[PDB]
Design a protein around this ligand. Structure first.
Ligand SMILES: OC[C@@H](O)[C@H](O)[C@@H](O)[C@@H](O)CO
Ligand SMILES: [Cl-]
Ligand SMILES: [Cl-]
Ligand SMILES: [Cl-]
Ligand SMILES: [Cl-]
Ligand SMILES: [Cl-]
Ligand SMILES: [Cl-]
Ligand SMILES: [Cl-]
Ligand SMILES: [Cl-]
Ligand SMILES: [Zn+2]
Ligand SMILES: [Zn+2]
Ligand SMILES: [Zn+2]
Ligand SMILES: [Zn+2]
Ligand SMILES: [Zn+2]
Ligand SMILES: [Zn+2]
Ligand SMILES: [Zn+2]
Ligand SMILES: [Zn+2]
Ligand SMILES: [Zn+2]
Ligand SMILES: [Zn+2]
Ligand SMILES: [Zn+2]
Ligand SMILES: [Zn+2]
Ligand SMILES: [Zn+2]
Ligand SMILES: [Zn+2]
Ligand SMILES: [Zn+2]
Length: 314
């Protein structure tokens, strides 16, 4: 019956894994999802929101390219009575109907603390950023910086974007390897994909054993934690977070009272608890998806949208 438009920045690993959860929730709730991807382009994404508005969908979910963007489109949707939500990354507009977000400051702090823990408080790092001007790099950078403020013997030799993408990260890391070589003691990657690119560049330079930390716990990232290729990650289960977003959208379409700004807190993932994450995200995906609608409705009650039973969670 309900038609809910989705425009995402790109089909990243996180979004790709999460789409299955969104689509599972939609099918269980009589929602047709209109999927669009903006391939990392703000104007494309603006055009997609315009189109969804023109189509008269019941609600719109934006996973934004840029935080400072889409003002006219979000004001249009609001003026027309179409609930528009930001999910997964932030928008600056005051007109959102819902706002379903990770705590990216916390996640950045957590990854940097994992690295500081590994290094014993001393060493030289490089930092791979998400797309500049997205809330993910802004907020993860703030949390990294909060932790760097405690460690005078940790030095950042370089920081740059690789736009969430593995192969950008390989090329950035190869330039830093040619500049700094074995002065690089660790890599803090703002997502797992970029950390895996760095891993590949280091391998091809003949370096194994360099500490790398990520964020997301995508399939390949969890496997990297299990194998020791990463020191840790922070779980951002897209099946969970994106389905939570859709559930807030669905409640707004139905006129129900709902918490419209729940926060997804990413649990730390290490070799101690990576098995369970592997079951949910890698080896037992379909069993997890069979449970997802129920998990989502329970968690929308507690507000604890990240709960999935990872060791360490409440
Ligand atoms: O670019 C939007 C988000 O910041 C992004 O989807 C991140 O949450 C994710 O960690 C990237 O892999
Ligand atoms: Cl994937
Ligand atoms: Cl699917
Ligand atoms: Cl589907
Ligand atoms: Cl791309
Ligand atoms: Cl306004
Ligand atoms: Cl912690
Ligand atoms: Cl802590
Ligand atoms: Cl993956
Ligand atoms: Zn892409
Ligand atoms: Zn699948
Ligand atoms: Zn699907
Ligand atoms: Zn453009
Ligand atoms: Zn902002
Ligand atoms: Zn307004
Ligand atoms: Zn916080
Ligand atoms: Zn911590
Ligand atoms: Zn050193
Ligand atoms: Zn920035
Ligand atoms: Zn590659
Ligand atoms: Zn190569
Ligand atoms: Zn994956
Ligand atoms: Zn809000
Ligand atoms: Zn919790």
């Amino acid at each position: 019956t309900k038609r809910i438009g989705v425009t995402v920045y790109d089909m990243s690993s996180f979004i790709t894994e999460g789409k299955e959860g969104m689509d599972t929730y939609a099918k269980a709730n009589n929602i047709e999802l209109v999927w669009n991807s903006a391939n990392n382009d703000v104007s494309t994404q603006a055009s997609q929101v315009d189109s969804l508005i023109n189509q008269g969908v019941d609600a719109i979910i934006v996973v934004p390219v840029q935080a400072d963007s889409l003002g006219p489109q979000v004001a249009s949707a609001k003026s027309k009575g179409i609930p528009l939500l930001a999910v997964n990354a932030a928008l600056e507009t005051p007109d959102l109907a819902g706002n379903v977000q990770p705590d990216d400051v916390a996640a950045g702090a957590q990854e940097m603390q994992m690295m500081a823990d590994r290094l014993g408080g001393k060493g030289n790092i490089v930092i791979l950023q998400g797309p500049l001007g997205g809330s993910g790099e802004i907020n993860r950078g703030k949390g990294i910086d909060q932790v760097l403020a405690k460690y005078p013997d940790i030095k950042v030799l370089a920081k740059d974007t690789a736009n969430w993408k593995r192969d950008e990260a390989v090329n950035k890391m190869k330039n830093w390897i040619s500049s700094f070589g074995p002065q690089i003691d660790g890599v803090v990657a703002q997502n797992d994909d970029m950390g895996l690119g760095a891993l590949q560049a280091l391998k091809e330079a003949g370096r194994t054993g360099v500490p790398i930390v990520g964020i997301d716990g995508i399939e390949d990232g969890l496997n990297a934690v299990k194998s020791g290729d990463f020191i840790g990650t922070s779980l951002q289960n897209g099946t969970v977070e994106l389905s939570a977003g859709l559930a807030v959208a669905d409640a707004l379409v139905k006129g129900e009272d709902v918490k419209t700004d729940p926060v997804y807190v990413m649990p730390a993932i290490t070799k101690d608890n990576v098995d369970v994450a592997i079951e949910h995200v890698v080896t037992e995906r379909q069993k997890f998806l069979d449970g997802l609608v129920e998990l989502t409705q329970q968690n929308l009650k507690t507000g604890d949208i990240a709960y999935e039973g990872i060791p360490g969670q409440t």
